[PDB]
Design a binder for this molecule. Structure first.
Ligand SMILES: *[C@@H]1O[C@H](CO)[C@@H](O[C@@H]2O[C@H](CO)[C@@H](O)[C@H](O)[C@H]2NC(C)=O)[C@H](O)[C@H]1NC(C)=O
Ligand SMILES: *[C@@H]1O[C@H](CO)[C@@H](O[C@@H]2O[C@H](CO)[C@@H](O)[C@H](O)[C@H]2NC(C)=O)[C@H](O)[C@H]1NC(C)=O
Ligand code: OLC
Ligand code: OLC
Ligand code: OLC
Ligand code: OLC
Ligand code: OLC
Ligand code: OLC
Ligand code: OLC
Ligand code: OLC
Ligand code: OLC
Ligand code: OLC
Ligand code: RET
Ligand code: RET
Lengths: 296, 296
């Protein structure tokens, strides 16, 4: 199948490679196997099941709500590209230093990172407005991905430095994302809504934490994982990161909006100290509408 | 200097190229000249002058205000990389389809796009909060850059499609950025502040409009421009897009904050109709504090 030079002869006892002068790029590095047929088979199964979940979430969302649909929209377009051109440039970039860069992965990330982080800043769906913190989250997260993608394209000590720059931005993002979830938890009603927020927190930090781990493990890092191996790992954390989290999001949103339909918008003033933070606690009781300084 | 294969022999009347079997990537496409010495000279002069402006803006900003400094911070780091490794991977990506992709350019864009667009959503510096519109601006702008970078890495009809997808996202961004500037203009005091907002609008749409134009003109498009030619064009719109716009921003911010120091925060209710929009007009007169439905 390949549309770089794949046919060559060894000359002078393999010290010289001779290739047709047909204008095609050539590098032996590009031709290294992507992994075993078993790894490939496992990856194609998880991909179909990802396509199925992406398809069902979209139709389900068909029955405010723009962030969840979009992530499933991007995810379906992703699978049609994977199905036709997963290992074709520029879904994979084959570069002059011999690297394989999965641009397909990083592109999806940059496209939906605003969508996800806006959704992070809007778990309840009630806010019309976003604080200063949201803005720092977006700037830090996009820096992370840009430094990391630079690290994937680089080699040796230059790859190390850009990874480190990505990590520094990443830590700032993780720190502030933690505060958001804390605020969300003490904002939503006391019952099922706080189970779902807790569910979303776990999914978010485990799935987001696994990305730098799979970077260091993959061809972009210490090459422990094969390409199919990395795909399989990505499909699992992909399902968690996108489909499942947006599904939990939509679910949470429904619960909160139905709370306004039954009890109404009854806010409180839970002053947290996890510092000197403040929160508007939705409650099911009209009576409860006052300042609860819960210093953590 | 190059760290891809640059030394080769033609064999069988130039139908075969023979190269040392030293593991280096090889492509004739990579070795195409970057342009004339005159183009290169012009580019190195504009770069130094860009370094000088980046350096003076930073020290000037040393005497709230985080978005302007950052763009100058990123811009200085950019020049030190240009000075040492402008044509080294991954500042330029040399790929298997023979493309040269100026990753250095697109990386800077993704890094500061949140910073600039947050600053777009905060011209006065008085807001602590951001509307729904800000969030659509960030999602659409990041999609634009991601589709466009994909188009730069691709060829033939696949490059056409991703460019078109970038343009569709871009138009949504331009449309909404236009409304922001309209709101800003009717929010700020009547005097010098509305001159500066008008200045920032011109700089923003001319400089931002020139990027897709320079894409279509450069190696990423119809290859009208050489690489040094594209650098020279980029230095001019770079100075406008980053240094000058942030300088005008900081200037505007100072003027607005000094208005609060002298007259105080005296808002109004200018109801625009450019639709049914609304605005809080800062005025220098305490008397003026009422609803002015100025249907445009
Ligand atoms: C051709 O190159 C090959 C490299 O494999 C040479 O074969 C080996 O020779 C070295 C001795 O320098 C040994 O260390 C290896 O054990 C040899 N065999 C293999 C299978 O690697 C071969 O000697 C070279 N021929 C000439 C004329 O230079
Ligand atoms: C070697 O290839 C070259 C290609 O340049 C051949 O030279 C040219 O031959 C063609 C005829 O097929 C003409 O159209 C050109 O005008 C020729 N000259 C140049 C300067 O391009 C040459 O004939 C080939 N030799 C062999 C034995 O195949
Ligand atoms: C808060 C969440 C916690 C989780 C956060 C994840 C942190 C993992 C970092 C590891 C440091 C090790 C250094 C990594 C350097 C990468 C560069 C690299 O792979 O170098 C290429 C090598 O030189 C040629 O094979
Ligand atoms: C509102 C602001 C107005 C300004 C907005 C800018 C719009 C310019 C678009 C041009 C369309 C022409 C099509 C462009 C297609 C690009 C793909 C391309 O270059 O194709 C490679 C070619 O096939 C091999 O050389
Ligand atoms: C868990 C991954 C999905 C299920 C396993 C699929 C797989 O890779 O099994 C192939 C088999 O071992 C043939 O060699
Ligand atoms: C969002 C991510 C996009 C990745 C880009 C993947 C787009 C796949 C295009 C593959 C390509 O270059 O096509 C080659 C050509 O069709 C055969 O000759
Ligand atoms: C905050 C204070 C400034 C330090 C910030 C970034 C360090 C990276 C510097 C840029 C050099 C790039 C070289 C590389 O990544 O290797
Ligand atoms: C430490 C590394 C830099 C971390 C990445 C940048 C953090 C975002 C930033 O600069 O935002 C701060 C601003 O003051 C908000 O108002
Ligand atoms: C306007 C661009 C900056 C000034 C012109 C520099 C330049 O390119 O002039 C070189 C000269 O023509 C030698 O060949
Ligand atoms: C922000 C943009 C970053 C572009 C990355 C540019 C970083 C330049 C690194 C150049 C490189 O790969 O260095 C080769 C090596 O130092 C010689 O053997
Ligand atoms: C809104 C309705 C859906 C259409 C949206 C995007 C068009 C691009 C489809 C993705 C195909 C990629 C192929 C390419 O870019 O060539
Ligand atoms: C038409 C192409 C798609 C344009 C790019 C996407 C626009 C952003 C979007 O989907 O945001 C709308 C949302 O409903 C805001 O609340
Ligand atoms: C498609 C959905 C998601 C949630 C993608 C997320 C990607 C990341 C969280 C990536 C993180 C990185 C870090 C923290 C540092 C190294 C470079 C990475 C970009 C891999
Ligand atoms: C570094 C500062 C700035 C303001 C960079 C801006 C870049 C753009 C506005 C790019 C726009 C593009 C468009 C509209 C469509 C084609 C692809 C591009 C990414 C080149």
């Amino acid at each position: 199948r390949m549309l770089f030079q794949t046919s060559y002869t060894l000359e002078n006892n393999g010290s010289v490679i001779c290739i047709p002068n047909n204008g095609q790029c050539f590098c032996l590095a590009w031709l290294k196997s992507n992994g075993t047929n078993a790894e490939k088979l496992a990856a194609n199964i998880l991909q179909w099941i990802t396509f199925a979940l992406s398809a069902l979430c979209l139709m389900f969302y068909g029955y405010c709500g723009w962030e969840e649909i979009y992530v499933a929209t991007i995810e379906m377009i992703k699978f049609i590209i994977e199905y036709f051109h997963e290992f074709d440039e520029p879904a994979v970039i084959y570069s002059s230093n011999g690297n394989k860069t999965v641009w397909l992965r990083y592109a999806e990330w940059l496209l939906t990172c605003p969508v996800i982080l806006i959704h992070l800043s809007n778990l309840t769906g009630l806010a019309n407005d976003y604080n200063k913190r949201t803005m720092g989250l977006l700037v830090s997260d996009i820096g992370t991905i840009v430094w990391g993608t630079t690290a994937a394209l680089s080699k040796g000590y230059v790859r190390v430095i850009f990874f480190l720059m990505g990590l520094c931005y990443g830590i700032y993002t993780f720190f502030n994302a933690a505060k958001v979830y804390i605020e969300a938890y003490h904002t939503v009603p006391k019952g099922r809504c706080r189970q779902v927020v807790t569910g979303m927190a776990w999914l978010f930090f485990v799935s987001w934490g696994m990305f730098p781990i799979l970077f260091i493990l993959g061809p972009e890092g210490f090459g422990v994982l094969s390409v199919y191996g990395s795909t399989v790992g990505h499909t699992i954390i992909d399902l968690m990161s996108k489909n499942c989290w947006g599904l939990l999001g939509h679910y949470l949103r429904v619960l909160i909006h139905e709370h306004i339909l039954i009890h109404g918008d009854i806010r409180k003033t839970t002053k947290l100290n996890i510092t000197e933070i403040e929160v508007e606690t939705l409650v099911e009781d009209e009576a409860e509408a006052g300042a609860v300084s819960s210093e953590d």
